[PDB]
Write an enzyme that holds these catalytic residues in place. Structure first.
Site, PDB file in Angstrom:
ATOM      1  CB  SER A 159       4.340  -2.176  12.011  1.00 21.16           C
ATOM      2  OG  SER A 159       5.339  -2.847  11.199  1.00 21.16           O
ATOM      3  CG  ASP A 259       3.174  -0.760   4.500  1.00 15.46           C
ATOM      4  OD1 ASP A 259       4.108  -1.505   4.536  1.00 15.46           O
ATOM      5  OD2 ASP A 259       2.578  -0.536   5.663  1.00 15.46           O
ATOM      6  CG  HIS A 289       5.493   0.431   7.361  1.00 14.02           C
ATOM      7  ND1 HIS A 289       4.557  -0.429   7.385  1.00 14.02           N
ATOM      8  CD2 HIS A 289       6.294   0.548   8.333  1.00 14.02           C
ATOM      9  CE1 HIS A 289       4.887  -1.067   8.674  1.00 14.02           C
ATOM     10  NE2 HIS A 289       5.736  -0.566   9.244  1.00 14.02           N
TER      11      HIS A 289
END
Length: 317
Positions: A159, A259, A289
């Protein structure tokens, strides 16, 4: 029925899923820190050891601590993974990635340098990427003492940590000091402009969504940054803005279906490929996500196994 393409196995884990709302950063930090520390309590460190390293920061910056995980019994010099945790640039700790770093050290026999970078907004760009590059400079320069093979350094993260990894790998190439053998980008946060279809359409998807994306880049780039149309954004802050991707390391990049970061991840992977870089790109179906946190799901297990396969092969002799 809200997200009918979700894997049923994941679907389950969704009614419990806490809100990590960036608008209230202290509370975001607390519910995240609890959604992780709960998991660290029973974590096994069998077959590995952890010690803290201290990398000098860039410029007059403070020392950057590194949680340095090594496999026991291991002839060494061994490859090393520099790992950078996620959290939207503003939340999270290096220890929150201990599960993965232990896994890599135990299953692959590789050292792992898990970097404690400074968080935004208290430290805005360039600080956080400078801390990651400082840690890379340090592990490379001290490789012998650390039992590391300097020719087999991977840089990776998840991320925001994947954006920091990609920026650190751009910086490493451009400065010509540290050779990076492999780049591992999991659900990376790469583009501040928020103009992809996933970024315009995923406004209340699980864990990450367009409202969090706006707040994350604002915290990281600071009170001067004026938004997507700002022309003065460093390629080390937002790697999707880089135009020359040639000569970057072989890369693994994964994205999740639901996501908001999905499309910028696929686009970066495609542009790396078009620049002649060896890339494995995998967008997993029915995921969101952070659904890898549902480690029991078969799609999560498949992703985890492939991550180890990718890193193992990426750092072969």
């Amino acid at each position: 029925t809200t997200f009918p393409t979700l894997d049923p196995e994941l679907a389950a884990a969704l009614t419990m899923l806490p809100k990590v709302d960036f608008a209230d950063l202290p509370n975001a930090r607390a519910t995240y820190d609890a959604l992780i520390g709960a998991m660290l309590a029973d974590l096994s460190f069998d077959g590995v050891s952890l010690r803290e390293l201290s990398a000098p920061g860039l410029d007059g910056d403070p020392e950057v601590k590194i949680r340095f995980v090594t496999p026991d019994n291991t002839a060494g010099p061994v490859p090393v993974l520099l790992w950078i945790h996620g959290g939207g640039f503003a939340i999270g700790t290096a220890e929150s990635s201990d599960p993965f770093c232990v896994e890599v050290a135990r299953e692959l026999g590789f050292a792992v340098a898990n970097v404690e970078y400074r968080l935004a907004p208290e430290t805005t760009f360039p600080g956080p990427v400078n801390d990651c590059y400082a840690a890379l400079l340090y592990i490379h320069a001290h490789a012998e003492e650390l039992g590391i093979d300097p020719s087999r350094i991977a840089v990776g993260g998840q991320s925001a940590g994947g954006g920091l990894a990609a920026g650190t790998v751009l910086k490493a190439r451009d400065e010509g000091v540290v050779p990076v053998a492999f780049q591992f980008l999991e659900i990376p946060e790469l583009d501040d402009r928020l103009e992809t279809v996933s970024m315009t359409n995923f406004v209340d998807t699980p864990l990450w969504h367009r409202p969090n994306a706006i707040l994350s880049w604002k915290y990281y780039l600071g009170e001067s940054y004026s938004g997507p149309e700002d022309p003065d954004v460093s390629i080390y802050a937002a790697p999707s803005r880089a135009t020359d991707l040639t000569g970057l390391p072989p890369t693994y990049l994964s994205t999740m279906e639901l996501d908001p970061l999905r499309d910028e991840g696929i686009e970066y992977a495609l542009r790396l490929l078009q620049a002649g870089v060896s890339v494995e790109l995998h967008s997993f179906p029915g995921t969101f996500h952070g659904s890898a946190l549902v480690a029991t799901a078969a799609v999560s297990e498949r992703g985890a196994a492939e991550a180890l396969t990718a890193i193992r092969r990426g750092l072969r002799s």
